[PDB]
């Protein structure tokens, strides 16, 4: 987590690559790039964070791991297990667990993100940057005047 | 770069209404027991529940419900297990499913409280889904469920020992619940299961977000002449910041960063989502609803009564009269209805209007026109969550006949600060980017904002850099209603702080030939803040309409403008100050995220420079010597834009804003008229 | 068929801005250092100023936010390794 | 530019519900009659 | 201006319930047992428990709706099918009617029958209806800037 | 529709039978691509075009 | 892979319902590698296939 940024969990690593990568943005601190630089099929435009808190495990002295089939809320008012006609007899409910109010339980917290409908780049740039349609190593002498196997 | 441990407190609720048991009706109760003085005096108990599951037979063991064919004893018989069966949702199959021999059902104790199904938890007990508490007998937890047969009342009336069971429902103990809920309508003040608290009623509390500010405001010290910061050459010992208590940062900030790009897009890495709310919330287009046609219910299975009746097959006469006989084909007994059948009836929009017209306008007003409840305590600070959880709002001020088919907004709800609100998007997607329990690890990243040293090209060396945080749990926090957060218990704790920073891997050279250039003297660098004015705020006692303010004599050289608004004590704290006590607001501050509402009560101002020579000049304006900004009906023939304001003040704001005005008006174009400008914000009602 | 005789009002919102008057002749924006600031009437001799509102009445206590719009500028320079410096001016309301 | 003809199987829906009695519940069976064993006969 | 009619989403019918929760009832009566000593199984009467109390067994009464396709019928209705041309519609059953063909009673007191726009017209395909291309589409109240213009 | 809950086995007009139900299947809709793709071959040595 | 057996394999409501994961933006685990393109809802493939 010493690395972790954005409220997600992406090394800074990968986000100054995109960045730059895609907009050349990244040596002057971050900011949303402008329209027309981020049309559909952009980077930015498909980004996004998420984060949510579950019961954990060990530590709410009172857990109690129930499966699907024994569980039951809104109880006679709704099927069992079926979309047919309701069943069963009123009841307080078992288990959606609480998480907040007086009576919380310990959480612990997950992290991740969704990012669909884009290519991941990787410039072959000296300093990861945009500034030709042929790039700068590419025309490095060491590259164009003998061979090397790739790994 | 900040890591950090976060806790909410009690008081935070992220959603609209409640999570169990939702569905059922707001008054029904559940299956109990309750005891009644005897009529000593052997007080009884009287049960009110009822029984869904159908069984086999019944005997002193329970009720049996399996049958293991291949049993050492033949077909030996197998009962319920008392922990966990019968399960509370299993029903019946089909709508007639004609009625069994026996049944059975769960029941709860006298001893717990009795609260109705909406809002009613109890945290299970056992891997299978029980929810019997557990007592501790030889170091061993065991259960307490306890059978207790039944049978008809018929009872009363012949016969004898041929009484046999017809109904085992097993009873037992609960840790109930109510996380988010609360009565609406207690009958007695005292709290021993009467006969009548079977019909006690709960709705679920106002949902409340607790979040980081917009762009972390709050969280560095700026202009706090008690601790400003410090960036300077090591060796100096010298400072390189200088800072007054009227340079308003924060303020400027927003500003810069709405005119350089767009906001209606958010940023995760500097929580950059600025405070809207919804443009009907504000302003009401009542027009009703769309119901020409009625809607209707119907009986589960089509038919609600019946009929039995006989078939008749015709027989008919001899000769002349015809006569009629019965036939034998069919059956005897049929059911057959008559007519329409019997339907109830519900006006489904109308009713949807009216919900979303209470919950979201009514439980807003001022506080001033509720009144304190009946038989539940309410705790006598007016600021805490409780008081505004609990007191009552009458539904009848706001329906669907209010200002019928006009667009406008209710006088009351003119001052109060509609960024509270709980429709606020960019304080829900903040909420939701931490995660909606109430312990929190986070991770975050502030920015710099001193303009002064905001984008300086800093040259090699060695400096020293330092600067302050608060600890404070209302200014770097934000609620959604209002409430303060001292009292209720928010705490927040700072375990490691790191900092980053990035280069550029430049070439050797160029960079020396670039250091050396910009050292001279004559190409320094030059810096200028965005927003670039002084502050100035002066004491409003209440119930007055009139301000004089006096300068002393001074000079004015390269002036630019003035310009003013209106603020609420109660949501400002002081300047300067590390820590303001008085403060007991954890809304959100107009005075350093701009978002202002007073702007409409108003009535005019005046100049002058020493006190005898008016500053519109030489009879520019309409009037002789001041701004009238708006007037009141008596204005005939002043009033512009079919609404209160003069064109003057009209015509000056225009200009101010757009340079437009001295050749007809017109709508100024979009890129030149941002969030924060004038006409994207006007409404005349 | 049946309307009851009435009476009209009206209203506006403004929410969210600040509202402006610039230092002008003519209420223009004709470049930042405005003429009228340099003019030799206000910048060669004192002056004292005297502002009155007429507000709407409420029942909280309430503030009255003015905003003096003036000059904020820094000049920084650094000769040497490891050493900055920088002077400030702020034009009236200086310090 | 072409021409011709499609045809979409029979696996081919393009609404949620359907249009035949959407309104009546769903248990309701409509008017019948049916035969049974008199086991008395 | 165009129906794009995709049916509507229901897949679990909603039910509503009896304003106290439980059915009907039937009185009934506490049992013990005192032990069938040598025989089956005595079966007398406790006194703890007061001998008239409320039950009722299996199920409980309910009753059935279709939220979803009942709303857009309101819709489609209200929306589309009182614009259609005069002549799809027959004059009311014993109510006075003004004959100037014009004024606001006629354009009201007239009646149009439901089942010509169903549910189901032309369901599943992107379409406008025959009689109303014909006929203006501005003079509609879901219009925007008459609305506006008629509040301010 | 299908039936979505069926108390017995034989399809027989029975006195239980008035209890079966229904639901609707889902829906799924059928077209051309979009931008014909595919509709043309291309990068395939088998069918190569010729201009 | 035909229809009917994508159209007869029930699920049961309680997997999902309005008591889950509340007041927390968030996506289900199981539909993180999910085809979200295949979804009735789309509205280009709705459009052409009207079309
Ligand atoms: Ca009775
Ligand atoms: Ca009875």
Same mark, same amino acid.
């Given at each position: !987590? ?31 790039? !402008?329209?027309?630089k ?30 699907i089939?024994?569980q ?22 078992n ?8 009576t ?14 884009t ?18 190593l590419?025309?490095?002498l060491?590259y ?8 | 770069?900040i ?20 569905? /059922? ?9 309750w ?15 009822q ?8 005997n ?5 419900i ?44 006298k001893?717990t409280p ?24 030889n ?39 109510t ?50 910061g ?8 010298l ?8 340079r ?5 900030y927003?500003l810069?960063?709405?005119?350089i790009?767009?906001?209606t ?25 769309e ?9 589960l ?5 019946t009929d ?9 006469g ?5 006569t ?5 084909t069919? /059956? ?46 309410i ?7 409780d ?38 998007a ?16 986070f ?13 300086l090209?800093l040259?090699?060396?060695?400096? +020293? ?6 600890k ?5 926090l ?22 980053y920073?990035?280069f ?8 020396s ?21 002084a ?12 301000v004089?303010?006096?300068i ?5 050289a390269?002036?630019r ?61 309409? +009037?002789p ?27 000056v ?15 100024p ?17 | ?6 009476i ?9 801005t ?15 250092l ?7 009437? %206000?910048?060669?001799?004192? $002056? ?14 309430t503030?009255? %936010? ?10 920084? $320079?650094?000769? $040497? ?6 002077? %400030? ?7 | ?19 035949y ?21």
């Amino acid at each position: !987590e010493g690395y972790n940024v954005a409220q997600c969990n992406m090394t800074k690593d990968w986000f100054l690559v995109q960045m730059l990568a895609n907009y050349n943005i990244g040596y002057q601190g971050f900011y949303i790039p !402008e329209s027309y630089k981020d049309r559909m099929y952009s980077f930015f435009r498909n980004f996004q964070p998420m984060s949510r808190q579950v019961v954990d495990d060990t530590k709410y002295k009172d857990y109690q791991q129930v499966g699907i089939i024994h569980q039951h809320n809104n109880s006679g008012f709704v099927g069992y297990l079926a979309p047919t006609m309701r069943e069963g007899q009123a009841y307080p409910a078992n288990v959606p667990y609480p998480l907040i109010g007086k009576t919380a339980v310990d959480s612990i917290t997950q992290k991740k993100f969704l990012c669909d409908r884009t290519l991941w780049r990787i410039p072959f740039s000296s300093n990861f940057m945009s500034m030709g349609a042929l790039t700068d190593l590419g025309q490095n002498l060491l590259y164009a005047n003998s061979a090397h196997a790739l790994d | 770069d900040i890591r950090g441990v976060l806790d909410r407190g009690p008081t935070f609720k992220p959603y609209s209404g409640t999570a169990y048991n939702a569905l /059922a009706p707001k008054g029904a109760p559940n299956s109990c027991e309750w005891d009644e003085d005897d009529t000593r005096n052997g007080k009884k108990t009287h049960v009110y529940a009822q029984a869904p599951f159908a069984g086999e037979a019944i005997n002193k063991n329970g009720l049996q419900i399996g049958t293991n064919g291949a049993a050492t004893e033949g077909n030996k018989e197998i009962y319920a297990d008392k922990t966990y069966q019968p399960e509370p949702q299993i029903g019946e199959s089909q709508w007639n499913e004609a009625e069994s021999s026996v049944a059975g059902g769960r029941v709860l104790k006298k001893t717990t409280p009795m609260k109705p199904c909406y809002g009613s938890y109890a945290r299970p007990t056992n891997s299978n889904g029980g929810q019997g508490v557990m007592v501790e007998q030889n170091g061993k937890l065991e259960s307490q469920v306890e059978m207790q047969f039944f049978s008809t009342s018929v009872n009363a009336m012949n016969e004898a020992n041929a009484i046999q069971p017809k109904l085992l429902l097993y009873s037992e103990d609960v840790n109930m619940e109510t996380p988010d809920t609360h009565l609406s309508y207690k009958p007695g003040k005292s709290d021993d299961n009467s006969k009548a608290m079977l019909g006690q009623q709960s709705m679920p509390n106002r949902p409340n977000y607790i979040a980081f500010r917009d762009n972390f405001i709050g969280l560095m010290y700026y202009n706090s002449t008690g601790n400003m910061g410090v960036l300077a050459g090591q060796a100096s010992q010298l400072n390189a910041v200088v800072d007054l208590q009227d340079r308003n940062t924060e303020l400027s900030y927003q500003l810069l960063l709405d005119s350089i790009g767009d906001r209606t897009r958010y940023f995760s890495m500097w929580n950059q989502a600025v405070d809207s709310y919804d443009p009907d919330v504000r302003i009401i287009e009542n027009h009703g609803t769309e119901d020409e046609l009625p809607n209707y219910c119907f009986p589960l299975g089509g038919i609600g009564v019946t009929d039995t009746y006989q078939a008749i097959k015709a027989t008919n006469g001899n000769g002349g009269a015809t006569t009629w006989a019965q036939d034998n084909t069919f /059956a005897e007994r049929n059911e057959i209805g008559v007519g329409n059948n019997f339907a109830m009836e519900i006006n489904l929009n109308a009713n949807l209007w009216r919900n979303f017209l209470y919950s979201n306008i009514a439980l807003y007003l001022p506080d001033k026109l509720k009144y304190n409840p009946t038989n539940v305590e309410i705790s006598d600070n007016p600021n805490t969550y409780d008081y505004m959880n609990k007191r009552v709002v009458a539904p009848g001020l706001v329906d669907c006949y209010i200002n019928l088919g006009a667009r406008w907004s209710l006088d009351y709800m003119d001052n109060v600060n509609p960024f509270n609100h709980h429709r606020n998007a960019g304080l829900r997607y903040r909420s939701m980017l931490l995660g909606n329990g109430r312990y929190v690890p986070f991770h975050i990243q502030v920015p710099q904002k001193f303009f002064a040293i905001k984008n300086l090209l800093l040259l090699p060396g060695s400096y +020293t850099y330092e600067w302050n945080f608060r600890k404070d749990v209302n200014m770097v926090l934000q609620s959604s209603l209002g409430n303060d957060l001292r009292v209720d218990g928010a705490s927040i704790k700072f375990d490691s702080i790191c900092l980053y920073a990035t280069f550029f891997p430049m070439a050797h050279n160029t960079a020396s030939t670039l250091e050396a250039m910009l050292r001279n003297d004559t190409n320094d660098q030059s810096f200028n803040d965005y927003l670039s004015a002084a502050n100035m705020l002066y004491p409003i006692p209440a119930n007055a309409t009139n301000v004089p303010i006096s300068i002393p004599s001074r000079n004015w050289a390269a002036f630019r403008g003035w310009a003013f608004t209106r603020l609420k004590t109660k949501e400002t704290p002081s300047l300067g100050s590390g820590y303001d006590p008085y403060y007991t607001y954890s809304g959100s501050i107009p005075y350093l995220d701009g978002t202002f509402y007073l702007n409409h009560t108003f009535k005019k101002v005046a100049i002058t420079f020493d006190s005898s020579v008016s500053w519109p000049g030489n009879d520019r304006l309409l +009037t002789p010597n001041e701004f009238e900004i708006k007037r009141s009906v008596d204005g005939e023939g002043y009033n512009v834009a079919q609404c209160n304001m003069t064109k003057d003040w009209f015509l000056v704001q225009m200009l101010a804003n757009y340079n437009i005005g001295y050749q007809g008006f017109y709508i100024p174009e979009s890129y030149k008229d941002r969030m924060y400008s004038f006409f994207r914000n006007f409404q005349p009602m | 068929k049946t309307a009851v005789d009435s009476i009209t009002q009206k209203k506006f919102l403004c929410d969210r801005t600040l509202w402006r008057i610039p230092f002008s002749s003519n209420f223009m924006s004709m470049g930042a250092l405005t003429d009228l600031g340099q003019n030799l009437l %206000y910048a060669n001799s004192a $002056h004292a100023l005297d502002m009155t509102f007429e507000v709407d009445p409420m029942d909280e206590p309430t503030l009255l %936010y003015v905003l003096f719009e003036v000059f904020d500028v820094v000049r920084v $320079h650094q000769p $040497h390794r490891g050493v900055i410096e920088t002077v %400030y001016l702020r034009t009236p309301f200086s310090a | 530019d072409i021409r011709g003809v499609l045809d979409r199987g029979p696996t081919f829906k393009p609404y949620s519900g359907t249009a035949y009695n959407a309104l009546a519940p769903k248990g309701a069976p409509n008017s019948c009659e049916w035969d049974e064993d008199d086991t008395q006969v």
